[PDB]
Ligand binder design. Structure first.
Ligand SMILES: CNC(=O)[C@H]1O[C@@H](n2cnc3c(NCc4cccc(I)c4)nc(Cl)nc32)[C@H](O)[C@@H]1O
Lengths: 53, 271, 232, 336, 212
């Protein structure tokens, strides 16, 4: 009576959850990896004068 | 002559084999960091001794046979280099033997007595004794000590021209070739008796192969020498045979020491 | 933490005095130790230094080879043995601890000092004055100048601001031009660039009075400033 | 039955609400975007000094400080520009499974099989590193200490529950339950108000650190999840199983965005990290090497291959200037 | 090019390196023994008989042993056992009384088969011997293991069980099993562990050399 009640209540909040979808948030990961591509020292390597290692 | 051509060709091929083998042993030990412990320290010391016995003592021996008219002393230098490197290989083999005896006899106390410093100190002591024994002749143990010709300066280089026979017999062989063999023999006999009592023919097979290949390759040229010294006679082809047997032990050592360790067997097959 | 020295007193010239610095309350075997001195009413002057484990030992070129440095690490006792003493060696000697790692405050705790009295290239740092009169509630700016640019290639500007209240030992305020010390009031601030260095004290209180000091670490021998005294 | 019927139709029709509004896969849109090639990264620094397996590692907040925790009971703080050891902390337990660095550089938390999250203080008045607070109260082994502030930290455990503690008092301030296996990992969100946790029941779950709320559940693997990290903007999180699959899930789209496996891979992932642009999803493997995967096309754009044992920990700096890796051969190797 | 402070920093880094190396050496002369077994198998009895994770440190004949007990693991998912590589030996305890025997057998198979424990010898113990016979009289291995057809006496059945556990070893080429039966009351449980670890170490040493 109260053993699976908290489980179905967590499923009620997992029913009422933000539904930004697999193509609504797909362009959010491409926007983050595109607009910050110049700041990444591993994707685009830094010149060997600005390299502290 | 045919004998000279045969002796030169066999010597060069054997030396090339020794160099290639020891180079491959060193490549294998360095590629795998797991193979960088005490036993592999001794093995790589023997590998360098063999690279020296194969790189210099192989063309050093061809030069000695040709007998070019090189300075009396320049020849004694060539002979002493040969003696130092060969005695170094023999001492590396006696070191490997002693390390195995210590591991088998000291048991757990082994790692508490054997540290890296003591390992480099024993390898160095071995190489130093080798240098001393091989270079002793320049300090008076030369044919020049008996020559009434203190004025012989230039001569064709023969091992006979610069080396006293009594040394190659009473000092080199009886002290630095026979004694290593007797001590390695007693060590491996005890190591086989201990490993058997605890447990095994694989242990019996490896030790005998090693003692079988050292004795076979260092006894026959040595006895050519022992006989010549004591008033006997020996065909020249027998002399070439002994020389080739020693320089062949040089190349045989890698296949019977380094390829006996399952880890070095696994790394080598991978490469 | 309690550094406390001994070996002070009057000596005639030609003699040899010796000083001990007993430490109580920290790991003395992990700290490098400087000996600093201060002549009567003139100003501070660095003397010697001994890095942890007794490895690196440096001296001032005034008495280099004329003093010697000793250290007892499992007993926590630091010694300075002076061999010949003229009428300039008379000073109040301080024993300062110094730990060196990335981000440390390496002139943090100063010892209580001991009085020694004798009977009768290098970077120059200049302080602008010797007395500034002020009342509480007034923000004061002190400034000092250096010979070379203290800004190293690391980015660190090795300038140190100390304060010596009257009757007390010195106390670190700034350890790197613009870096406060351990538990000093945040009223103080340090700024400047390369050679010109200013310490701004907003909301001056009654205790802030005393002789201020600026010192470079860039070069051994460590050279102190002349000493600006705030007056009230 | 009634509640079983309602829970079955709840999960199936919420999955139908996900599928009916599921427009397309992540690759179907990013297919026309050009790849990045071969990111041949070279070992610049080779930190040595550990004499046992290295289990975890955390970067400093200034992209220079570092902590590495090993099996021989040692915690080492490295200056990663000059390869100098800033600090060496003896660890009450050699059974060290995880370690963390404070975002202010003041404290360092480390724990493991002894169920106790020790928290050490580096910026002391005495010049040594004493244990500030031993957070005890877990019934099993510990994983992923993650500092929120200097007085707040979330620690995962094998008690099927994670715990938000309070370093001042020392009590378990918030308890997150809901797993059916041993939570192996957690990763704090960049805004430090949410976190995700992956457990041995083949399922992760997004939790709120404020209310103790089970906000979202994630599934898709066949085996346990061994490590986890967030996409640097805090809207997606990639995990790594023993299924030899790294997977990228979106926190809002409620399903896995895309899988990062290759057919040639034999063994499972031990560590997962993200570059600063979110364009290189690194992954340490048990095959003795890590793979820097292009996080949008799932192609291995480079292999960091310098270790002689299985990779155990990865870490990318806050600016993205480096990639520290640590493995069971006692060597952390920086790659730039 | 070092600044005045970088020189002291490098000196401190070198001093830290020295301390790490010298403490490692000390940590590498210690015998690490994992402790495994089913519940009520005498793990608790052996740890007391022996001279989260619970570590028992004891010195025997100059060998310092760290025996690590992981029975307190709340849920043995065993994704943490790989942490026990390198351990000299896995001391597995079983009780004839507790077909809990079939539970012990499945656990023994599991431990021997691991990719992490293929080179590590296993020291299997049947330590207690005061209640291992009074049950055999009333009930042999027929009740739990139907296949047995031997004399329902202590020695015969105990030897058969020992052999059936030994049979679980699927590769006898790399590892060995050392079994113990002598009563727990005699203080020889440690001595047997000492002999086995000595043997394991002697063999590890000669195997590296290539002699083995
Ligand atoms: C330990 N020895 C070595 O390592 C090296 O010694 C060299 N070697 C030894 N013996 C000989 C020999 N004996 C001729 C001979 C001996 C005595 C008296 C008279 I009269 C004549 N002739 C030559 Cl051309 N080389 C020899 C050989 O190269 C080995 O590598």
């Amino acid at each position: 009576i109260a053993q699976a009640r908290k489980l179905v209540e967590q499923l009620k909040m997992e029913a009422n959850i933000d539904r930004i979808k697999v193509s609504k948030a797909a362009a959010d990961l491409m926007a983050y990896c595109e607009a910050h591509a110049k700041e990444d020292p591993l994707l685009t390597p830094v010149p060997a004068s600005e390299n502290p290692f | 002559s045919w004998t000279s051509v045969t002796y030169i060709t066999v010597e060069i091929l054997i030396g090339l084999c020794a160099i290639v083998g020891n180079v491959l042993v060193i490549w294998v030990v360095k590629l795998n960091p797991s193979l960088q412990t005490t036993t592999f320290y001794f093995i790589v010391s023997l590998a360098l001794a063999d690279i020296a016995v194969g790189v210099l003592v192989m063309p050093l021996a061809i030069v000695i046979s040709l007998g070019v008219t090189i300075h009396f002393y320049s020849c004694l230098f060539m002979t002493c280099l040969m003696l130092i490197f060969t005695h170094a290989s023999i001492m590396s083999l006696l070191a490997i033997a002693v390390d195995r005896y210590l591991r088998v006899k000291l048991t757990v106390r082994y790692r508490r007595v054997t540290t890296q410093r003591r390992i480099w100190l024993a390898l160095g002591l071995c190489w130093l004794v080798s240098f001393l024994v091989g270079l002793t002749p320049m300090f008076g143990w030369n044919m020049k000590l008996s020559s009434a010709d203190e004025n012989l300066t230039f001569l064709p280089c023969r091992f006979r021209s610069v080396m006293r026979m009594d040394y190659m017999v009473y000092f080199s062989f009886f002290l630095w070739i026979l004694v290593p063999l007797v001590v390695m023999c007693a060590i491996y006999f005890d190591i086989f008796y201990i490993i058997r009592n605890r447990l095994e023919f694989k242990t019996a097979k490896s030790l005998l192969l090693v003692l079988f290949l050292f004795a076979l390759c260092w006894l026959p040229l040595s006895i050519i020498n022992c006989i010549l010294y004591f008033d006997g006679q020996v065909p020249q082809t027998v002399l070439y045979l002994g020389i080739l047997l020693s320089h062949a032990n040089s190349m045989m050592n890698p296949i019977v020491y380094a390829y006996k360790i399952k880890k070095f067997k696994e790394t080598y097959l991978l490469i | 933490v309690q550094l406390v020295e001994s070996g002070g007193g009057l000596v005639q010239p030609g003699g040899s005095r010796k000083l001990s610095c007993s430490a109580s309350g920290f790991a003395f075997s992990s700290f490098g130790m400087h000996w600093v001195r201060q002549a009567p009413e003139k100003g501070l002057e660095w003397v010697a230094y001994i890095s942890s484990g007794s490895g690196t030992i440096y001296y001032a070129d005034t008495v280099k080879g004329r003093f010697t440095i000793s250290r007892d690490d499992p007993k926590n006792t630091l010694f300075l043995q002076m061999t010949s003493l003229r009428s300039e060696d008379t000073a109040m000697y301080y024993c300062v601890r110094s730990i060196y790692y990335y981000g440390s405050s390496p002139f943090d705790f100063w010892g209580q000092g001991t009085t020694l009295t004798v009977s009768s290239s290098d970077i120059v740092m200049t302080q602008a004055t010797s007395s500034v009169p002020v009342t509480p509630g007034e923000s004061v700016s002190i400034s000092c100048r250096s010979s070379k640019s203290l800004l190293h290639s690391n980015g660190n500007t090795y300038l140190y601001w100390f304060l010596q209240r009257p009757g007390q030992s010195p106390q670190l305020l700034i350890y790197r031009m613009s870096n406060l010390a351990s538990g000093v009031p945040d009223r103080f601030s340090g700024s400047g660039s390369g050679t010109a260095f200013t310490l701004t004290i907003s909301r001056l209180e009654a205790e802030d009075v005393g002789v201020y000091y600026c010192m470079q670490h860039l070069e051994y021998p460590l050279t102190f400033g002349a000493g600006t005294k705030l007056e009230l | 039955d009634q509640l079983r019927q309602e829970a079955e139709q709840l999960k199936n029709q919420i999955r139908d609400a996900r599928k009916a509004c599921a427009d397309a896969t992540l690759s179907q849109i990013t297919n026309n975007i050009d790849p990045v090639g071969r990111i041949q990264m070279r070992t610049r620094r080779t930190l040595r000094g550990h004499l046992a397996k290295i289990y975890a590692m955390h970067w400093g907040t200034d992209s220079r400080l570092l902590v590495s925790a090993s099996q021989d009971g040692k915690l080492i703080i490295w200056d990663s520009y000059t390869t100098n050891k800033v600090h060496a902390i003896p660890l009450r337990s050699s059974w060290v499974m995880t370690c963390a660095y404070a975002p202010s550089g003041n404290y360092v938390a480390c724990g493991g099989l002894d169920n106790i999250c020790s928290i050490y203080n580096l910026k002391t008045r005495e010049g040594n590193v004493r244990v500030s607070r031993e957070l005890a109260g877990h019934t099993g082994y510990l994983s992923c200490c993650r500092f929120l502030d200097d007085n707040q930290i979330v620690t995962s455990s094998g008690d099927t529950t994670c715990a938000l503690w309070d370093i001042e008092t020392g009590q378990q301030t918030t308890t997150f339950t809901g797993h059916t296996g041993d939570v192996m990992s957690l990763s704090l969100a960049p805004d430090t108000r949410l976190f995700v946790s992956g457990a041995c029941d083949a399922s992760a779950k997004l939790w709120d650190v404020r209310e103790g709320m089970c906000r979202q559940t994630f599934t898709g693997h066949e085996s346990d999840i061994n490590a986890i990290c967030f996409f640097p903007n805090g809207n997606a999180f990639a995990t790594g199983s023993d299924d030899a699959t790294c997977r990228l899930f979106d926190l809002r789209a409620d399903q896995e965005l895309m899988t990062y496996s290759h057919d040639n891979i034999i063994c499972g992932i031990t560590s997962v990290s993200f570059s600063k642009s979110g364009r290189l999803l690194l992954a340490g493997y048990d095959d003795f090497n890590c793979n820097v995967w292009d996080a949008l096309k799932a192609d291995r754009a480079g292999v960091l291959a310098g270790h002689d044992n299985r990779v155990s920990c990865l870490g990318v700096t806050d600016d993205g200037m480096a990639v520290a890796t640590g493995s069971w051969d006692s060597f952390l190797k920086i790659w730039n």
